[PDB]
Design a protein around this ligand. Structure first.
Ligand SMILES: [Zn+2]
Ligand SMILES: [Zn+2]
Ligand SMILES: [Zn+2]
Length: 87
DNA sequence: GAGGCGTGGC
DNA sequence: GCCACGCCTC
């Protein structure tokens, strides 16, 4: 019934979900179980979604398509910042 | 562009 | 726990 708060002296951040805290706790430890298998990259991550996002950098996966223009991006926030140039 | 990070619906 | 959205920082 407790709210997920970090119990490391210095921290104290509280999160809404336990999974949020589990990701944060991996910052105190060095745990990054999600590795990038790309040739020569070596990047590792503590959250799965970050590896997915990072991986598009290697695959060229650009799902977010600018409809005024013909430039695409691998991330939603990348495109949103591009539309400002199309105001 | 890319990584760190907080959040929420499922 | 997954996955995606969105913001912050460099
Ligand atoms: Zn902490
Ligand atoms: Zn990689
Ligand atoms: Zn465009």
């Amino acid at each position: 019934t407790a709210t997920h708060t970090c119990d490391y002296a210095g921290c104290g951040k509280t999160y809404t979900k336990s999974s949020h805290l589990k990701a944060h706790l991996r910052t105190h430890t060095g745990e990054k179980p999600y590795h990038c298998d790309w040739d020569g990259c070596g990047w590792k991550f503590a959250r799965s979604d970050d590896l997915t996002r990072h991986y598009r950098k290697h695959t060229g996966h650009r799902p977010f398509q600018c409809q005024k223009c013909d430039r695409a991006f691998s991330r939603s926030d990348h495109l949103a910042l591009h539309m400002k140039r199309h105001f």
